Design a binder for this molecule. Structure first.
Ligand SMILES: Nc1ncnc2c1ccn2[C@@H]1O[C@H]([C@H](O)c2ccc(Cl)c(F)c2)[C@@H](O)[C@H]1O
Ligand SMILES: Nc1ncnc2c1ccn2[C@@H]1O[C@H]([C@H](O)c2ccc(Cl)c(F)c2)[C@@H](O)[C@H]1O
Lengths: 318, 307, 303, 318
């Protein structure tokens, strides 16, 4: 929605970090003695109402280089804001492309593709799938911003958030469906039983053939206290360019970055965890030609049922 | 480019050649921050649509839906504001001054046609009414609620100052004659009537196009034995007859093409020049084999009709 | 005292128009989300490939202003029940587009016309928009008390108005709403915007809109008789209908071009202030109207 | 399943009718003086366990012509039966292609494509969608068998089948979902209120661009008796080749063709219909890039709710 874009646009830090990532990339690809001989083909993928496109112009101004802009966007209502931006202010520099990035036949290849296709669990918005289908129109030596993202998980106790989840049961569906799906939530009253550890990582561009975005991770969380585990908090960390990064992992959290709140992966039944014990969790990133989703189980100290098998309770649509 | 705006809005609504050979242009912006319209004059038919190579120019506060020439000086305007406006040229024909702006229709005036004498004009609107006006008195003489749906096309008789055609989204093509206490009369024959053209020679024969791209030939004398041809694949938006002693029928459409037909309604010319909706056709008073088509793509294409 | 809105199909500058409308004294504005005359193409080239923006941008107003002051309107050229297959397909795609744009903006209500008997495809596409995505926008069906075909002046010579009192036929606009809302499975998101004509119909006809979800009443300029001081006023029977509608707490909507020296607003406000006094029962129950409660069981339960 | 193929294979009439359709097509494409100069590229699409492939060999034997066979099949378990057929008996004449017909890159174009992708409501198994995606590998003058199919509907009364449908309600779903989906059923105790009328028709190959398999039909059924309508029985009729046809429409029913039983399109609430009245029904064939489904409403004498809006209660997967 129009107000949703607005909310995700009111994060100065996030866009200034993107400005800097394009800025360092401009200098690295165009030397001072080529400042007017070379024009960089910049392609913002999933352009929204134009915030990355704007920061791309600000980056080309501070780095003082020539850039051919594109603004691929599938949502036609944002594409209205984009064409109204292009006429009124941007001009012929920006070429709006009203298409899904996986369909679009590009005039030429790009020097840099730039995206904001991430969510609180990094690959949960389906950024891997999208940039893969765009990779063919990236130069055989092109940059992808962001170049890498990693999801982190940490086990939590919160009988309060556990209750909040039970309260989400609805008629005409699985009486336990509310526990087999993640929620984005600003985790407030809760206890972190163990330090966040990495889970899934995606790198762009992905040179490797039989690339496969399906995953399976096994994590061992050492708990120093006695408690009752209710679920796993998810966080993300990403590298836009070189040392320019964005993060929501509380230990490495990018300061003052309101935008992405943490995720919550519930567990149907709470689990007693004694001091010294290890909470072992398995996660799986799954998919078919139509959907992507997660499945997950706790295997230590005690087992749980595998949550969301075959995306029965929750899927992300491709 | 006299004391006029610096940019004419993308969608060209109407092309009208006057007696000497000058080109009248009406256009509106149907997208963007501003949805207003404007009027333009081109003493050079080949200078159109160039906003900076015009003889005269003006800006209207609301969009331009339909226009007609009120002689050689004035221009009658059907606007979205629910108003009819007469804009007469100045002394040297370098300015377009608005004489009257009368908000009488409760919704977008879709059509306007000047009555044979040149003293009256009839307007059709989305408010479902048909109004007869006095261009000199600045007032409406009669208001008629004959239709059930919005009025699509109003076409005044070539000579009779009381006779005119009317067609609306209620499948009604009404033949008028303000000389009766029941002025309208349903002319029968299917698909919705979209465009009307009186024949310039047989003042008893007229043509109409429907929303299924079909053009029909109808006689006032008999409401049967109608001659028809499926000219276009989409709604017939306009029909204009050539100035010739034996005229040619030009039919513009939503299928982005121009068609030129003879008496048997057979195709002589076809033009794919346009990439957007073909909104008008005007034959040059000087070269009768010349036809000017304005569209929505900003193109003003001049066709040499193969006669 | 009354919640009123201005309807227009001509908005050249949204900030100017909205500003002037509010300046007049209107709580909201019913306006087209796309240009009324901007017919679009979705199947065949080259008008399908029409470039540039399709309408104005959402930036021209704050999100708060779109949520509280702008009622969208379906473009009159969109006819999903047309007998022409090409026009149906195009108007299906165009209707989804327009509805989805109104949902994108967060508009509180969107207007759709009920002016013919067969509205099946219109209702199918509205129902589908309801089931596609999370938006909660209300839908106001613009339906008249009297069909336009039954109020046309008796001036067509070979088609005279059937003057006979047709009991069921006099209430054909109710059946139009009825079938439409039956098709839509009685969605609580589809309400009525009742257009009140110049000549009020039979009392039995106005008695069919009782118990129906009238969210708004559309009063056109055309229906206002003039008083001795040159100001617009209403007949005693039209005044009675407004008094009935005030109990239903409807939003009055003013449509059409001007025909008087807002004065129309002032008349409604005057009627609102000069209404009969609501008794103690009407003051006690004010708030509890149509609120379902469970009957107390003081034998079984403790009060 | 293996036993499902078996059941749909035990219909002699159905396959002998296909044999004859190929037979007449062979003679029409290959003249007697070209009996050994020309070899017809025959492509069975959706080959199952090989019944159309077998009838194709029987047709080439009676017509005495040379044929290059292909057996495209997506179900890999049937493809096992196909490769075991090809090795043991068919030989190099038949080329098994383990693929979806919409993915397959063909060596050459085909003279005739042959399919059994029909169901009781003709296009309900998704035959339009499949043969469209195969059409590119059909010769610019090729034949498609079947070349046309049409669905028929007729309004029925049966308070018995109406009850059978109510009895299908399940927990964890819409309490009325059972009425917003078709069922294949051998309609026994029932009353046909009006004669079947045509509904949707598909022709193959479909030369027309912007082809679009979406539909909307409006039918008027004249009822001579007083009754209570409970739903609409669906039937199909198809032209394999010229006068060689298969049908389930009771008036034109192909004699002794057990295979396809009729469909039943329920209606949530039963409707009283007086003598002389007309039962008017609307049907819609709908689709998105992932699913196809029907929506339907009764508009006369009284209205019903539109059934299965947005395929909420029932979809066919693409
Ligand atoms: N495969 C595809 N092809 C073309 N565009 C695609 C996709 C998939 C998603 N998107 C777009 O990416 C944007 C991004 O998620 C975004 C940007 C900015 C803000 Cl503030 C925000 F909330 C969200 C959205 O606008 C999506 O519509
Ligand atoms: N797009 C596709 N690409 C490749 N094959 C496809 C499709 C879609 C369906 N099919 C196959 O067609 C067969 C047919 O429905 C059939 C044949 C014989 C019997 Cl007896 C029977 F019951 C069913 C099935 O075996 C399906 O697996």
């Amino acid at each position: 929605e129009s107000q949703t874009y607005e909310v995700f646009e009111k994060d100065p830090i996030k866009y200034s970090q993107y400005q800097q990532a394009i800025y360092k990339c401009l200098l690295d690809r165009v030397p001072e003695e080529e400042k007017d001989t070379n024009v960089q083909v910049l392609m913002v993928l999933g352009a929204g109402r134009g915030p990355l496109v704007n920061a791309s112009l600000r980056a080309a101004k501070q780095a003082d280089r020539r850039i051919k802009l594109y603004a691929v966007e599938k949502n036609p209502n944002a594409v209205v804001t984009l064409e109204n931006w292009q006429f009124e202010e941007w001009g012929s520099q920006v070429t709006v492309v009203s298409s899904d990035m996986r369909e679009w036949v590009a005039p030429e290849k790009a020097d840099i593709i730039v995206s904001e296709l991430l969510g609180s669990f990094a690959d949960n918005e389906l950024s891997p799938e999208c940039l893969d289908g765009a990779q063919h129109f990236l130069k055989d030596d092109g940059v992808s911003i962001p170049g890498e993202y990693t999801s982190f998980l940490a086990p939590i106790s919160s009988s309060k958030l556990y209750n909040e989840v039970r309260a989400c049961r609805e008629k005409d569906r699985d009486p336990e469906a509310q526990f087999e799906m993640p929620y984005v939530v600003r985790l407030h009253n809760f206890h972190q039983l163990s330090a966040p550890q990495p889970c899934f990582t995606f790198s762009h561009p992905n040179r490797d053939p039989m690339i496969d975005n399906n995953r399976y991770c096994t994590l061992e969380f050492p708990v120093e206290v006695n408690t009752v585990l209710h679920g796993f908090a998810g966080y993300f960390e990403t590298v836009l360019y070189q040392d320019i990064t964005l993060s929501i992992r509380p230990e490495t959290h990018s300061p003052g970055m309101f935008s992405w709140f943490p995720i919550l992966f519930p567990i149907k039944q709470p689990i007693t965890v004694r001091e010294g014990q290890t909470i072992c969790v398995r996660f799986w990133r799954c998919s078919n030609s139509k959907k992507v989703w997660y499945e997950w189980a706790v295997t230590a100290p005690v087992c749980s049922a595998i949550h969301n098998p075959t995306g029965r309770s929750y899927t992300i649509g491709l | 480019p006299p004391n006029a705006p610096a940019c004419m809005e993308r969608q060209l609504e109407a092309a009208r050649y006057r007696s000497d050979g000058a080109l009248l242009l009406g256009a509106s912006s149907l997208s963007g921050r501003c949805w207003a319209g404007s009027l333009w004059l081109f003493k050079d038919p080949c200078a159109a649509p160039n906003e900076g190579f015009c003889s005269a120019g003006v800006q209207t506060e609301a969009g331009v839906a339909d226009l007609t020439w009120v002689g050689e000086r004035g221009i009658l305007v059907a606007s979205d504001s629910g108003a009819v406006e007469l804009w007469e040229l100045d002394e040297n024909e370098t300015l377009i001054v608005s004489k009257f702006c009368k908000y009488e229709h409760d919704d977008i005036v879709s059509t306007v046609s000047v009555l044979s004498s040149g003293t009256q004009a009839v307007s059709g609107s989305k408010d479902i009414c048909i109004k007869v006006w006095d261009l000199a008195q600045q007032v409406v003489l009669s208001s008629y609620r004959a239709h059930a749906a919005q009025v699509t096309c109003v076409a005044a008789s070539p000579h009779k100052d009381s006779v005119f055609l009317s067609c609306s989204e209620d499948n009604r093509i009404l033949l008028w004659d303000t000389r009766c206490p029941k002025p309208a009369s349903q002319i029968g024959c299917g698909y919705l009537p979209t465009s009307l053209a009186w024949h310039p020679q047989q003042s008893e024969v007229f043509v109409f196009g429907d929303e299924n791209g079909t053009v029909s030939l109808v006689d006032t004398k008999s409401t049967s034995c109608v001659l028809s041809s499926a000219v276009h694949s989409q709604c017939v938006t306009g029909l204009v007859f050539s100035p010739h002693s034996v005229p040619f029928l030009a039919s513009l459409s939503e299928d982005c093409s121009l068609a030129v037909l003879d008496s048997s309604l057979s195709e002589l010319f076809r033009s794919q020049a346009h990439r957007d909706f073909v909104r008008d056709a005007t034959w040059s008073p000087l070269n009768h084999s010349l036809l000017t088509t304005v569209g929505w793509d900003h193109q003003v294409v001049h066709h040499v009709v193969p006669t | 005292r009354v919640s009123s809105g201005r309807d227009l199909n001509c908005v050249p500058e949204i900030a100017d128009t909205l500003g002037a409308v509010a300046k007049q004294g209107f709580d909201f504005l019913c306006m087209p989300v796309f240009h009324p005359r901007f017919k679009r193409e979705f199947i065949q080239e080259p008008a399908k490939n029409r470039p540039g923006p399709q309408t104005r941008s959402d930036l021209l107003l704050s999100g708060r202003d779109w949520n509280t002051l702008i009622v969208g309107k379906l473009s009159p050229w969109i006819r999903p029940d047309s007998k022409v297959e090409k026009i149906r397909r195009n108007s299906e795609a165009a209707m989804l587009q327009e509805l989805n744009f109104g949902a994108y903006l967060g508009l509180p209500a969107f207007l759709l016309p009920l002016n013919q008997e067969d509205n099946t495809n219109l209702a199918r596409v509205l129902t589908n928009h309801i089931h596609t995505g999370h938006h909660s926008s209300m839908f106001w069906m613009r339906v008249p008390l009297v069909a336009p075909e039954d109020l046309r002046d008796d001036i067509i010579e070979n088609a005279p108005t059937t003057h006979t009192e047709e009991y069921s036929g006099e209430e054909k606009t109710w059946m139009w709403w009825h079938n439409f809302r039956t098709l839509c499975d009685y969605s609580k998101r589809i309400a009525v915007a009742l257009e009140i004509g110049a000549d009020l119909p039979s009392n039995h006809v106005i008695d069919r809109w009782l118990g129906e979800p009238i969210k708004a009443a559309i009063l056109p300029t055309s229906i206002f008789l003039t008083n001795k001081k040159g100001f617009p006023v209403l007949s005693k029977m039209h005044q009675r209908l407004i008094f009935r509608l005030l109990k239903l707490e409807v939003q009055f909507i003013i449509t059409g071009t001007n025909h008087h020296s807002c004065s129309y607003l002032q008349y409604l406000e005057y009627l609102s202030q000069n209404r009969p006094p609501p008794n103690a029962y009407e003051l006690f129950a004010k708030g509890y109207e149509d609120y379902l409660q469970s009957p107390l069981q003081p034998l079984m339960d403790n009060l």
